[PDB]
Amino acid sequence: YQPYRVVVLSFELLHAPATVCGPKKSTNLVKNKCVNFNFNGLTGTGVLTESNKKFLPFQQFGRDIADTTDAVRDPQTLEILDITPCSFGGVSVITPGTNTSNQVAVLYQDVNCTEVNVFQTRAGCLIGAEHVNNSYECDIPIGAGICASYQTSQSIIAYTMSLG
Amino acid sequence: EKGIYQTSNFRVQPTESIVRFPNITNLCPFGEVFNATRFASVYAWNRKRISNCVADYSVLYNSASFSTFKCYGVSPTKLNDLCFTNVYADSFVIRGDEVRQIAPGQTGKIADYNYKLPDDFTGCVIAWNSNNLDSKVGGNYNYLYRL
């Protein structure tokens, strides 16, 4: 016979705006790291960094010419951050003939490979081949005027190819 | 043979997952309906409209201050992130033996003549002891229910 204070909760959807909603979570901000971002209405991957854009007060999203997300406003802070796609590229194996040697050099194309001897070039960066100041004819083309060859007790060298 | 061949596609993997949501400030007035000093009678149960606010059912589920927490049509741990157009909160006083009759498909004096739930009723029910507040020395006669 003890009195019980009861509450009855009813929920329904009337093909109407979701006036009532529940929160999921929130995390601390991370910059200069390839992360999977979640925001008010977009999800994806990319590298977030401090920007210098001029978003309007009512605007929250950024789009480039090709209609790809560029910058996103922070929901909890009046700060706007550019989104740079996480680095990617092709992996090219530079080798002489297998009958010559088994030493190979690897070219990570179009990446600043401080993120991946090591030689940085305009076609990516060449790992496994040493850079020399001499100039020869092009044996194995790499790009941007750089060629590689199996010369000098032997290794793979990277030089600027000589026109003649 | 001697030459350069493309073999793979290098790409940096994401280190971790980051989630950012807007500041929680438009909290629903659940603290008032659940802690009201006085409540309406069984036959004149009041209906409270809750809308245009953010609701937190996780704290209510983990509050551990409610004797009975039964959900119909939805899991108690699944509606935390789910959204509804309108929220209805009906609160009244029910006898200890009558608390089991507040459910869809039930039959009884209060169920049939005071408050009838739909056969396809959805939501959750809240119930907790109130003998230390709704009972007084000499008898409390402020609650009316139809017979």
Binding site: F11, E12, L14 | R47, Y88, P118, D119, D120, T122
Partner: peptide, 18 residues
Amino acid sequence: YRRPREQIIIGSLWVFCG
């Protein structure tokens, strides 16, 4: 009252009528 199913998706057809 009882409402058509085309208008309510999640909730029950029955609505407040007191």
